[PDB]
Design a protein around this ligand. Structure first.
Ligand code: HEM
Ligand SMILES: CC1(C)[C@@H]2CC[C@@]1(C)C(=O)C2
Ligand SMILES: [K+]
Ligand SMILES: [K+]
Length: 405
């Protein structure tokens, strides 16, 4: 279902990539996006899929565009257009300098000092979930660990009841990987209708949870509005529920297939932080973008005002111009170059939380269950969208080779 080619786009720049269903998905989602980096494809192309939009395919262009918010605005950062237009999360729907005072409040609530404060709980929950699974000799990693570990920590941080998880998980899925049951607008409104009473309750009687802090914070000398707090909390929910969850499945699926990579981390745990970076590169999973604020010529290509451009955070680290043998996982890379948490002013606010969750998962899983694999015959399906993911991940192991700590 292609949209008619706009008159300003030359035919040689056409490449009909569908970000929500790439043709190569059976081979792995990162591999499916990497077709955009074969020699037949220009640096910057127009797809007629999903309403019609640009895609930058090279790390250099993606970084440049994310830096230049003057031409590439966050006002409409999602494809398709209806989703980008409905999208009003704070601070991600704002350009500098407006984004600034909000970014600082996001940092207050999900930044380093909060992570450092919650580290014990993070550690506690990983060990608990893992020990609980360990003697089973099998699990569905997506539902058995990948979801509850990051999500319960986020609900803990936000002071929200775990009973609300399935509902919230549904709405977030719809926003990043639309199935078609509901528009982005409807999904957002459902999410906001959940947030609205909570925020109100918390402006009246402040707590110490992230939502209380946001809803009672200050921006530009004045109190945050109930509407702004809602737009900010909505983003935090999305980030909390649908990023690390999906990334953990990619990493664990990989580790299920490489005993030598496992042993590398088991023998020298100080390598785990670098390994985290490398897995973040190889299994990068986000792709949003920007909208053109005016007519602009960018690397020889005529862009028109209102044109959307997808700037896949996923592609920069897979670009062979940034990393040699990009599809190989090499914990010893002298520089892991990537933009997995993004680039420019909107560089992920929760990246420290995410790394902590990944680093804890790697160490605690490999300690107790050093030897595991994918269930025999099992076929792993990836899904693609604004955030790519794993449908299911059946793992198996012999409990005789596992360890309680
Ligand atoms: C592996 C995990 C994660 C990845 C790959 C990721 C990716 C990203 C990316 C690419 C952006 C920039 C989007 C843009 O430029 O439009 C972003 C922004 C953001 N993320 Fe993350 N994220 C992760 C985890 C989290 C978590 C756990 C949170 C917790 C709340 C979070 C909260 C945020 C927030 C608040 C922003 C907005 C920053 C701003 O606009 O100033 N992220 N993330
Ligand atoms: C693109 C993102 C990963 C980033 C954090 C959540 C997300 C879906 C957003 O809307 C901003
Ligand atoms: K290309
Ligand atoms: K918008």
């Amino acid at each position: 279902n292609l949209a008619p080619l706009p008159p300003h786009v030359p035919e040689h720049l056409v490449f009909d990539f569908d970000m929500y269903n790439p043709s190569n998905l059976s081979a792995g989602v990162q591999e499916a996006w990497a077709v955009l980096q074969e020699s037949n494809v220009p640096d910057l192309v127009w797809t007629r899929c999903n309403g019609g939009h640009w895609i930058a395919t090279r790390g250099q262009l993606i970084r440049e565009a994310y830096e230049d918010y003057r031409h590439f605005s966050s006002e409409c950062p999602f494809i398709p257009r209806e989703a980008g237009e409905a999208y009003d999360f704070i601070p991600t729907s704002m350009d500098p300098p407006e984004q600034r005072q909000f970014r600082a409040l996001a940092n207050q609530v999900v930044g380093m000092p909060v992570v450092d404060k919650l580290e014990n709980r993070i550690q506690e929950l990983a060990c608990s979930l893992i020990e609980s699974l360990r003697p089973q000799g099998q699990c569905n990693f997506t539902e058995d660990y990948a979801e509850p570990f990051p999500i319960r920590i986020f609900m803990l941080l936000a002071g929200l009841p775990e009973e609300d998880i399935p509902h919230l998980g549904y709405l977030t899925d719809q926003m990043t990987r639309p199935d078609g049951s509901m528009t982005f607008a409807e999904a957002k409104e459902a999410l906001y209708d959940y947030l609205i009473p909570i925020i109100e309750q918390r402006r009246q009687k402040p707590g110490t949870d992230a939502i209380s802090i946001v809803a009672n914070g200050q921006v530009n000398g004045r109190p945050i509005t109930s509407d702004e707090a809602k737009r900010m909390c909505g983003l935090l929910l999305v980030g909390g529920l649908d990023t690390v969850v999906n990334f953990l499945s990619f990493s664990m699926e990989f580790l299920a297939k490489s005993p030598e990579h496992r042993q590398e981390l088991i023998e020298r745990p100080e390598r785990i932080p670098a390994a985290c970076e490398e897995l973040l590169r190889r299994f990068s999973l986000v792709a949003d973008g920007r909208i053109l604020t005016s007519d602009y010529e960018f690397h020889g290509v005529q862009l028109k005002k209102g044109d959307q451009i997808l700037l896949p955070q996923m592609l920069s680290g897979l670009d062979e111009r940034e990393n040699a043998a990009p599809m190989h996982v090499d914990f010893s890379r002298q520089k892991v170059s990537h933009t997995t948490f993004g680039h420019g002013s909107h560089l992920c606010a929760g990246q420290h939380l995410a790394r902590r969750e990944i680093i804890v998962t790697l160490k605690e899983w490999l300690t107790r269950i050093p030897d595991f694999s994918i269930a025999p015959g099992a076929q792993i399906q990836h899904k693609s969208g604004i955030v790519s993911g794993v449908q299911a991940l059946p793992l198996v192991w012999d409990p005789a080779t596992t360890k309680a700590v």
